[model samples]
Target: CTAGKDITCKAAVAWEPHKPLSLETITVAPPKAHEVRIKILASGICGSDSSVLKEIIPSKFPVILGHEAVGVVESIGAGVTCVKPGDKVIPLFVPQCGSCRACKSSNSNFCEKNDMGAKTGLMADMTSRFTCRGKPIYNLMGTSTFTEYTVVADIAVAKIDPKAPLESCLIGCGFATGYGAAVNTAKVTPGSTCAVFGLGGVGFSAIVGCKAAGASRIIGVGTHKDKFPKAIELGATECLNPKDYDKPIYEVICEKTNGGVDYAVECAGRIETMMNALQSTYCGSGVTVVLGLASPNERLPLDPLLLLTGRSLKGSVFGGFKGEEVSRLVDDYMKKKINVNFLVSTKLTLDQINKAFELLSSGQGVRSIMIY
Candidate 1:
């Protein structure tokens, strides 16, 4: 793939803080070594995107921002053999190269190469490929698909069956993040009781993952009554509206489980939910997985007495699995086991990026996808 193509396309950009996304024409650089150029077909607005928009997470401005996407490869850089032009692919927010130390280990999600890039805020070559009006724009997670076309490393793209709907595949990030937190990180087993503190996109996916892992009792906690039925439909055995509970929901969860749940997932990204997840798990058998990205400055307060118990606390990023493994898992569940179609509440166009973020911030739906 070559640069200087003079390509012009529309993209939603946050040019500055506290301003609406501006639709602008931008140029895309061609794929460099071990890179691929993709024409995005569908993309999803993530809660992280909301945080970025609100400046909750410090990010560079004038950036095309979206992480979850499905697209077709338009071109490939030299020495790229894993995927070719025209292949249907899903972009992993965290790129994984098989030869990396972390990828060679059991923890592929924490690939060293990806970590290097993320920490440096640069591409593989320690420089950015995106530019607007001749000024460089920071890449978001190295897989910005908010624009019509973008370039990414070949290792970051997972080739999926062309038959799958690109719109649904765009949920790969949320599903993998949520589902992997349950099945892989916590290792939920058959007949175990689990509680998820949130019925949003990630929470609902955790419920489904718990069901697929053969958990006999799955309880979903949320303040909204309307999300309860949807949570049950997505494999939650029971739903609890926190508003109706007199005492802390964690106490109720302990009573329901006769002690406490075997596993508890914190997906709401709130202080209260984080505490609840820790308190809802059994002392000896509990495993509390923190999947939410809480405020950067917020610290989790813990009791030394609680740590003395057999309980454990773990943090998961990008599902604690490699991108390829996540893609396969998503396909298996979507094709054979789980029906994730209902999880998508609405679909929008690329120009509606702001509206999509608004919907996610308001908790209007599990996901808002943009079909380009």
Candidate 2:
């Protein structure tokens, strides 16, 4: 499986910041040692990927940007047994190497091996397998799904139950991250009170997770009203628009809850929202989870007086989960326990990917996925 003719495929490549992804014919090389080449069948369009498109995440130009995808293994490198040709799998942007220090710890999923190419798309050996116009292109977050085919680290891809609808791949990242944050990191308890700020894909999932965790009350906040109805359908007790109240959102929430919620998850991806979410928690022993990433060198001023109390703020990535175990968990949650497909607003073919971005830019819809 390690030796084969290069596969020719079509992919969306970002040439520079703020440029629309261009459709190009690229050559995908056969997997080398410890690698696996996959044929992407379904991929989610995530806001984080848009950060790369807008240069918010500091992406390397000419990179294939996409992290959440479900695909079939087309080839396997030497020593690969975790998966094989014809097996269905999901790729993890925040990969895991069980022996790494992070994986060894029970409290973390940020394995040290996540940065495979460490900013270059080249894999551990520092060589890329993708070429367009005879020039090498880089990978995004190790799993570049904007293309029809991608080569990924064995540890970064997880084998899933073959009978599962590949579309359940939404759990690959977006759904998993927020669900993990509420159920894993925040540890939302049954009968607890929780709030999720910003009703994007993950934000909606976060509140649904809160409900699944048995939270009695779940509140969602944001500027848009279009998502409020869907929010309730997913599990939000109610929705609030900040503009409706003149006071700071925290003040409104605190008064509404008689002293703020027990837990708050911030998915708005902005510092101001994070701060407000932090202040929206109960004064003593309240916890606020920050799920959004910040701009490089972005700094926030915290009133020391607030921290003097029992309030705590923490950051979470990939929902503080080992992607492998979570993939199986997502399968059971969606297939056996619940119908989670409501998260996908509109489905598109790979060629209409740009429209997915437009939907994201409008900050509307639960999620847009590419069905290849």
Candidate 3:
């Protein structure tokens, strides 16, 4: 009876920047045409979520701040043929509308219909599907899952294998973003040396991708020495603490790899780190891929000679995997081809959402999953 009607549930509402999220009773409207409503099963607290809450990344107020999530489709609206009720799925923050030019192209993953670039905080039709205490609440990147139930455009929700675990939420963002950056964007080569400039979930997943791509030596670079062991467990050949060195971190990486690593993956989302990642690559033919979401006002000022010398600089979102290709990743997880269980450092419930953000900001955990 609730299939075609609104559902009342609890959601963590970020009324404004730099404030603790308020867990409030909210009303979730039914999905519109070509949309689907999901009852969130598990949602991962990502760095971007913390960034948005801290005002490092600009977003509308009174919004639900979450994107990396796994859920079950509870209802489907008119023209929604991609999935039916009861299908297990992951909501895509970067949706691939088949008709978009980026979707049609083989080398691009940035879909034109995606809400990431513009930050509309609403659905395709420019409206909100959530409200609390008689006020409209905006969604986050179209996949907002900081609530029990959320609506998403049909093209933005990927139907995954039914047997997938709740940890599969990482596949929707972190795992895919880092893994795809190596396997797809950078095209990391076998028997080569690589440097991952972050020790968080995305950075760890980049290490996973490099090893899966057959890289012989993978280096983990970060400020925290505490995460090195896990990085090594996930296939990192060595780990470096940038703070221990007097000179630039790139110099240390270059010395360790003989002439700098063959590939460098930047996940820290800082200007200095981006430059260091570029410098940490071999000047002749190394490739650097940036997956971090930096501030809107920040810009990279690079010397043109970096590319003139044959090194390449690139960027990747969601690891360059289109929305549809996400399912194969789910299958990969189910088959043990990729390990994501270790990435889940802790798990909590929806009511403890603020603590989840605190854990993420503290950088003491890789990922904190909120189970409904």
Candidate 4:
């Protein structure tokens, strides 16, 4: 296909709220200025993607639903210098356009140019480049990686070494978030005790971080017992199910750690877990990191004295990472520096997206990556 020519591609489009995604033939327009077109090779089905698919996250209709993916650059727009055709890269939903105030600040990674408030599911120009049956369709989180071919802002793509398998690069989000939450935000230290709530992909990755950081004991908390083995494999010293405890989980955790853990991470995406994670830390000299995808109207109601007494709570977006860090992490995974492939529970072709969604929705799997 010519660089400016229209291309027809197959994509799983989310057409309505609370509905299953359908495969459709979509017309993908050529990249505009500062954008790059990528032919997706593999994409991980994240819990956040499920939320968007379920309408838990605000999404415009006829949206392509996926953000964490690896692809090869097929074409580029004018003035683009980051990557070239045939370059393998990961598309960033949380981009790093290095000159913004957020990027300029010392303790933040939020890019000012990408407005989280503007959830129209379109590009920066506020117009969609995807059309199906001659109707304009929305692209989710700017990546829209559920499709085989998609366009992303040049700032949104991070070129990686060609040697890394697309499946392993799926850590672009899940593993990075959890690992960074432990290492970056919480500063999990050697010989320290830590706890992670919710044994999802992020939680397991947090265990990996804990182990890497030399944490003495990692207490894993989850509703399901099936994930405990995986958590232990990743480095959890012990696991607990809230259903097995009659008292508050925080209290139970304190009893186990003899005054709570030094670090506690809440990855469950629930107010209750946030509260428990905060309380499960030692009142003084303890910290809790929130890595969950929070929602509106879901408030964290806790005593101010918690922070006043030296207990600290903070939130991590994309594991407190800039985009280039993701590329580095991709290299790390490929180099075998970070070993956490157990997070990839299932692999599927593009046609099996519905089945993949089912596995994720039922908690029957950890992460399902579509191998295109």
Per-candidate local distance difference test: 0.79, 0.85, 0.91, 0.85
Task: Give lDDT tens digits, candidate 4, residues 172-204.
Answer: 678888888998899999999999998877888
lDDT of 3 by residue, 246-311 (tens): 999999989888889999999998998999999999999989999887887889999999889899
Off-target runs (Cα >4 Å) in candidate 4 are: none
TM-score per model over all chains: 0.94, 0.97, 0.98, 0.96
Against the hidden true structure, what lDDT does model 4 obtain? 0.85
Query: Higher TM-score: candidate 1 or 2?
Result: 2
Cα deviation at 336, candidate 1, in Å, is 3.3
For residues 202-305, what per-residue lDDT tens digits would candidate 1 score against the true structure? 88888988998999999998877777778887888898888897898989999989989999988888877888899999988699998877777987788867
Per-structure clash totals for the candidates: 0, 0, 0, 0
- Which 10 consecutive positions of candidate 1 have the poorest summed lDDT? 113-122
**lDDT winner:** 3
Off by over 4 Å in 1: 1-4, 115-120
The TM-score between candidate 4 and the true structure equals: 0.96
Q: How would you encode candidate 2's per-residue C-alpha lDDT over 1-372 as one tens digit per residue?
A: 434769999999888888778989999998888899999998999888888777668767789988888888999998888888999888888888799888888899888887633676668788888999988898887889989999999988888877667567678888888888898888999888898998988898798789889999999998888889999998999989988888999999999897989999999788898988999999887888988876866776889777678888887788887866855665666565645577889899888999999998685698899988
- Alpha-carbon error at 129 in model 2, in Å? 1.0
